[PDB]
Structure to design on (767 residues):
């Protein structure tokens, strides 16, 4: 079973494909998408409804890859739509760093197809975590020919952040006197405008302040965050005299 | 108009393409880039100056995509270069998550080409945020055959920075005695060397210090930052005695 | 020489490729990887063991690209496996932004191949920092035909991190009385669950505490981290009364 919500990688043209060999360009990996089907006009040939290797041995493969870390949850294979050709068993190989390749599950040989069109699906628990994956047919019927699809987790909503950083201080004696709940606002303009409204984290890196009968009171808050900047509100209360406070900030936009 | 400073996606080989069907490999999406043209020698066929479908109906397309989120600002289409074939109208589809596709602009049919070579450009306002985008020919002259280019915003430099994190303390009594402005430096080494110089944000997560007639004074600064590490300078002044301090740090490396 | 531990980009299918021209589909970029080799059977053509241009001039190229920034450390070229065709000199161009192209080493003409199968390697010092790169044959032997590989630095463990952010407080008087080492835990849930265990940095943004004979004491520690959340353990010791503390936190997810 293909888990609900998963991404069809070839359907969405998310992976580059490279076969070991092709019978010819009209039998190439571009024709390997699961359920691939073309013209039924038998007078002209518009391509095999599969990838088909040229060499017939145990060393053929399609490699599927891209820069990003995919979490593959399953793989589906299928035979050739237009001729009695199919892969009947295959091994999997993969790589997360693109330098070291590993055998999936110690070189597990997986039972594949029995006919032209029936879909056989394999599920990975836990997901294979890879940048490139390769299918390696071991046995076949008539010829090494397949359609297939790879399934991956969708991308997390938090992914691909943009970040801007900086520091901000009171800079003067605004909170160094008076009584009660006291506030002073520093307006921060981000060096560059965000696309979406960031979330902002702050951290104190300087405290110069007087206790009030032994009590220390200071707070920093970010507020009125927009795409262009925000307000760092420096806060004190009781009778505390804050001479200076400094925060670093980290602003993060996603999605 | 193609907006100034845009990225030509197929030109920079930035998108994978997948057609519904190919007339044959010599009419493949590999031959679809705007203005593609090959040998003019009529005696030998080196492929169409177009992508060309095999099936002729309303259901053909090219899908274009990649792991990343594009900000598509425009699209251009053109007919076949070497025969009288072009797409007269098409719809667009796109997807951000690669699970749910949306009809561009509620399924708007866009008037496309009426010759081989004139370029028809469509602007997107606002930009289309998608991982994958598909052109869906609705009407054609003679055959479903086209050349195209997709245009997108350049990558902004504040996106996907690298990060490294860690913690640093005084770890001893260095600032816990003495008078006036007092500093001790902690030389911090990042777990992995960066390829270029990061910035280094810090925040305090431990105070253990004595007041000086009721005044608290401490500070931390990251200085002398390199690809390999930085110095966290712990500071006190007056007659504050600082028993220990701790910072979490976050080193952020941009555009690499 | 190819530096030990480089990534072979074409081998791992990390780049889209686009030629200026193909002799035909059976001579396309898909057949261009270093050492590419097909059936040795002379009674049916299964494609060239090379890419081969259609037009024979000095304006042919393959463009290799993708979304992410690469650091290319070397190129390797080869001639055609199956006929006496090979590139004898070439130039390189690249782009980091996919708007502005630059000429490798001010258009240096690199001496290339001499036969079908010997591999000629060029080292890039420093690495070419590029999203796309293009090989431009200048001279050739019989036909513009080649095989190649591009080598890149492996991705750093620290790249493409994701970040989540929030705040936590004691929010009550738990730490405000008693004596000796006292702790209170706040369980934090991440707005979205992470795919793997993050690291969690914190920095204080509120202190409301009493000194203990002039000594200030407070600490925050992020503990018990999972995909779903963590514990912020607020800490005081000696006889300090902490009325409240607040932290911001930065949760960072690596290698995903
Ligand atoms: Ca057919
Ligand atoms: Ca031609
Ligand atoms: Ca052959
Ligand atoms: Cl404090
Ligand atoms: Zn990518």
């Amino acid at each position: 079973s293909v888990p609900a919500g998963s991404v069809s990688c070839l359907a969405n043209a998310l992976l580059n494909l490279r076969s070991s060999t092709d019978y010819n360009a009209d039998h190439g990996v571009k024709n390997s998408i699961l359920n691939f089907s073309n013209s039924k006009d038998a007078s002209r040939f518009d391509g095999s409804e599969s990838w088909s290797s040229s060499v017939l041995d145990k060393n053929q493969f399609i490699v599927a890859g891209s820069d990003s870390v995919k979490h593959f949850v399953a793989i589906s294979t299928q035979g050739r739509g237009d001729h009695d050709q199919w892969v009947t068993s295959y091994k999997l190989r993969y790589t997360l760093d693109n330098v070291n390749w590993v055998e999936y599950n110690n070189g597990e040989i997986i039972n594949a197809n029995k006919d032209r069109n029936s879909i056989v699906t394999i599920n990975f628990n836990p997901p294979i975590k890879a940048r490139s994956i390769a299918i390696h047919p071991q046995t076949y019927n008539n010829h090494i020919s397949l359609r297939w699809e790879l399934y991956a987790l969708p991308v997390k909503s938090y992914s691909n952040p943009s970040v801007q950083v900086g520091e901000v201080s009171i800079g003067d004696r605004s909170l160094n006197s008076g009584t009660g709940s006291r506030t002073i606002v520093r307006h921060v303009k981000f060096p560059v405008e965000f696309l979406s409204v960031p979330i902002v984290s702050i951290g104190c890196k300087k405290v110069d302040a007087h206790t009030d009968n032994g009590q220390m009171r200071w707070e920093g808050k970010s507020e009125n965050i927009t795409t262009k900047g925000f307000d760092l509100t420096f806060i004190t209360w009781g009778n505390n005299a804050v001479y200076d406070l400094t925060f670093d900030y980290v602003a993060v936009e996603f999605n």
Q: What stands out?
A: DSSP finds no helices and 15 strands in chain B. The two ends of chain B are 32 Å apart (CA to CA). Chain B touches chain C through 56 residues (CB under 8 Å). Residues 89 and 110 of chain B are 5 Å apart (CA to CA).
